[PDB]
Write an enzyme that holds these catalytic residues in place. Structure first.
Site, PDB file in Angstrom:
ATOM      1  N   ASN A 188      27.235  19.696 -15.200  1.00 44.49           N
ATOM      2  CA  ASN A 188      27.660  19.729 -13.798  1.00 44.49           C
ATOM      3  C   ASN A 188      28.747  18.681 -13.537  1.00 44.49           C
ATOM      4  O   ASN A 188      28.547  17.679 -12.846  1.00 44.49           O
ATOM      5  CB  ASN A 188      26.466  19.548 -12.852  1.00 44.49           C
ATOM      6  N   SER A 215      20.743  16.120 -19.581  1.00 42.10           N
ATOM      7  CA  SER A 215      19.788  15.241 -18.919  1.00 42.10           C
ATOM      8  C   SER A 215      18.625  14.862 -19.825  1.00 42.10           C
ATOM      9  O   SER A 215      17.926  13.884 -19.539  1.00 42.10           O
ATOM     10  CB  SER A 215      19.260  15.902 -17.647  1.00 42.10           C
ATOM     11  N   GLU A 239      18.802  13.640 -22.802  1.00 40.79           N
ATOM     12  CA  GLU A 239      19.145  12.526 -23.675  1.00 40.79           C
ATOM     13  C   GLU A 239      19.288  11.198 -22.944  1.00 40.79           C
ATOM     14  O   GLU A 239      19.643  10.198 -23.576  1.00 40.79           O
ATOM     15  CB  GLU A 239      20.442  12.836 -24.430  1.00 40.79           C
ATOM     16  N   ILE A 278      18.752  20.961 -11.998  1.00 39.75           N
ATOM     17  CA  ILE A 278      19.157  22.268 -11.487  1.00 39.75           C
ATOM     18  C   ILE A 278      18.082  22.973 -10.669  1.00 39.75           C
ATOM     19  O   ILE A 278      18.399  23.939  -9.958  1.00 39.75           O
ATOM     20  CB  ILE A 278      19.591  23.203 -12.634  1.00 39.75           C
ATOM     21  N   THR A 338       9.777  25.097  -9.327  1.00 42.58           N
ATOM     22  CA  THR A 338       9.026  25.887 -10.298  1.00 42.58           C
ATOM     23  C   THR A 338       8.404  24.983 -11.358  1.00 42.58           C
ATOM     24  O   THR A 338       9.010  23.984 -11.768  1.00 42.58           O
ATOM     25  CB  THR A 338       9.916  26.958 -10.943  1.00 42.58           C
ATOM     26  N   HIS A 361       8.068  25.645 -14.407  1.00 44.33           N
ATOM     27  CA  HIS A 361       8.715  25.855 -15.701  1.00 44.33           C
ATOM     28  C   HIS A 361       9.765  24.786 -15.975  1.00 44.33           C
ATOM     29  O   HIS A 361       9.820  24.220 -17.072  1.00 44.33           O
ATOM     30  CB  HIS A 361       9.343  27.247 -15.751  1.00 44.33           C
TER      31      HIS A 361
END
Lengths: 147, 160, 158, 149, 149, 149, 147
Positions: free
Chosen positions: A52, A85, A87, A111, A115, A117
């Site tokens: 991003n 993200s 690392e 992002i 959820t 997941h």
């Protein structure tokens, strides 16, 4: 800009911890510890993600801007780039073990937050940074955002 | 004919390509960090290169959905040699399922001849709002190994 | 200047244009050599290694604030993939009209393996046909076929 | 100062210096070479092609072309002026000046007309297409500055 | 069979056999001469250029071309394939492949964006112009199997 | 060279010369007097106001402001630099520099933001309105150069 | 919190204007003016509206918090309450004419920003504050929000 707010907490952690390592008053009153908002003579480290590009870059500029306007010096700023993200915890731990660095700032973008997941990736980013702060006894700021 | 169709397929866009790509950058990043510092008079910026020559990698893959997990491995194999990594420096380990990926990756990460570890696997019944225990442990196991051993581990896993 | 340095440059058109130049400079080298073993299909694919390779970049000085992001992205991609900073030749032109003529001189040298063209285009009040924007694409395409050398083409419209 | 004739002229001087250094002596490493044209117009020869259509506007652009060259160190003895009846005939006239080895740059000035439809104007398309092909074949800069009425 | 890869492939075989008849001697006369291509791919060497963009759609077309040739008697060894990043530089890759004397025909596969909102496209036109112009110069048939989105 | 900082700077030098000759000695008839500012920056003092928002862009415009002045004969001792947190505070800071009798011209540099609706932006409207009123009251040139992101 | 940002601009205006009234260097370099983020020895004034109690109150607390954490003193803060957003310009002008006060902060909430009808009220609030800054030669911060 979360970058300005996350960076600002780093200045007042170095000053607060520096007072802890010193010596307080000789009683006679309620002893209190407090950190001031001056970045003179302090060293900082910044870890930022690459995903991003449109969102991350403006958060990084706030981090350097916060330090310099608050009396800091740009010569003491160290910046490390990571692919994603995932690392950040491993890169922050390597950076925080340096004796010269006083604080570590983490910047990233998530992002999803609605959820279970994607909570697997998001939880370990925050969990890893929290464990490093207690283990290394060095402040680490959690300045990532979600969108 | 079947051998031509399967080989002509491209592995550029799979998650195996991205997982192997991130390992190369992180391997070179730590090499620069452990080296000597800068000369000052400027703000230091650290970034890893994509030169895969002279670097050794390890790959752990599962057996579930062998028709789908194999092509993810080939994407990881391609990326290493794509940027200049020798094909003799990669190690492949297969595990029956996704539950035992962290324990297998622990042995490879402790070797002094391994610079990075890439994990490939697939999950089952991902279309549910309930919390999954086996899916949470495999993600947590790889995260703790990287912090304890100070060696980067890349996590690439998709859901059906 | 560190704030400008801190800005990310991965993923822009400059990064993508320079990426294709590295692959084709190695792809054409494979075709120059001998054939394969002749035991199965002979599939070619250029490598991303830029060690020992030479590149040239043509850029337009128009929109000086934005063109530098694409130029630095192309320069970064060469070094980030193993290329040497000493083997990069950079030339600058006023506008997009002079990009094809400048690229032809660099592509005619035997010491250049690929040429990258970077520029920006003007968008009018109406989506009418643009003579300047259409001509720059035709000039670079004809040069690549004539000179047997791959030239990348990455531009954006304001 | 702000007309398109001045802007078109300025590209001619800097290209003549840029192509001079590009084919000159080589570099010596230790850095990346940067090639950029200098604005000095001393010791350079130019050719100008102008169309007779809309004589009121064209004479203003033409006067700005010589004025820009002489201000930046040019000399009025070296410049050559050629006039053509219309925009369709600019490519054929510009080719004759460009083939001369005594000319370093060619400047084209003309005024176009608005077509009936937003479709392609055949006269407008060929004048731009022809000038670009001449530059690539002859390896000489050609400046294209026109204004649609 | 229902994809453009099937159609664009078989055109290469019958055009390759057509050129063989013309290069040979003439007929016996006494009637009108009709030159015909045959759907026999034995003894023919081909080349395929495909773009990596839009991985989902291109790979299905590439395997369709491979299915077409082997069905009509093609030999597996003679197939040569080259991959390119984008559709912009398809013809330059085909140029290095079509000029090999061992190669008889060249097949190009690519995918372009939808577009169609402007009056013209500056990329889809150049790839088609380059392939058509290259075929005439080399006198070698090159098919066109590019499909817009 | 082409940034708005360079263009905004150039208006400052020529206005200082224009207002100098306008209130100077009078004419003598026999023709119509023509007053036009000279581009020479020798013997002139300037003040610059810049906003901290979008530090990447602003530092580029600011560097062009000093570069344009010194190139046209200016001196870096006479120029004064003032920085403000945002665009809303430019009018109040520019007024302090303009009231000084040692300053000949004031240059304002800032970066604006796009509003939600095409309606009037109150922050954007007041910064332009305030600067113009200062120039009329104080009889001193004020240059307004901004770019909307 | 716009209250933290609006208040922060007030500290760096008092320091910047104090340097203007002083004396700069004796040439020999490019003279530059700059304000620092220290609120020691400075006086501030705050004007806040009464409408939208749930939104306005949290913005006011940021204004005092910004001053005290940046080295300021709470004894020098003056707060004035007004019925609506229409009365901010008239109250700010009376407050700014005091010689002791160095900066004025305005806090308010606007209810609409997508119609010309309500733009009549909104424009004069911003227009009045801008004129007072130039007339009185004293900084005034525009910290209102819209919702």
């Amino acid at each position: 800009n979360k970058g300005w707010e996350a960076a600002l907490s780093a200045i007042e952690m170095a000053n607060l911890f520096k007072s802890l390592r010193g010596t307080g008053g000789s009683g006679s009153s309620m002893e209190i510890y407090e950190g001031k908002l001056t970045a003179e003579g302090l060293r900082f480290g910044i870890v930022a993600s690459r995903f991003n590009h449109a969102l991350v870059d403006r958060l990084v500029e706030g981090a350097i801007d916060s330090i310099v306007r608050h009396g800091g010096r740009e010569e003491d700023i160290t910046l490390v780039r990571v692919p994603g993200s995932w690392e950040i915890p491993v890169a922050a731990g390597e950076l925080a073990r340096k004796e010269d660095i006083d604080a570590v700032i983490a910047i990233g973008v998530l992002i999803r937050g609605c959820t279970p997941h994607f909570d697997y990736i998001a939880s370990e980013v925050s969990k890893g940074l929290a464990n490093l702060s207690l283990e290394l006894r060095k402040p680490i700021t959690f300045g990532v955002i979600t969108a």
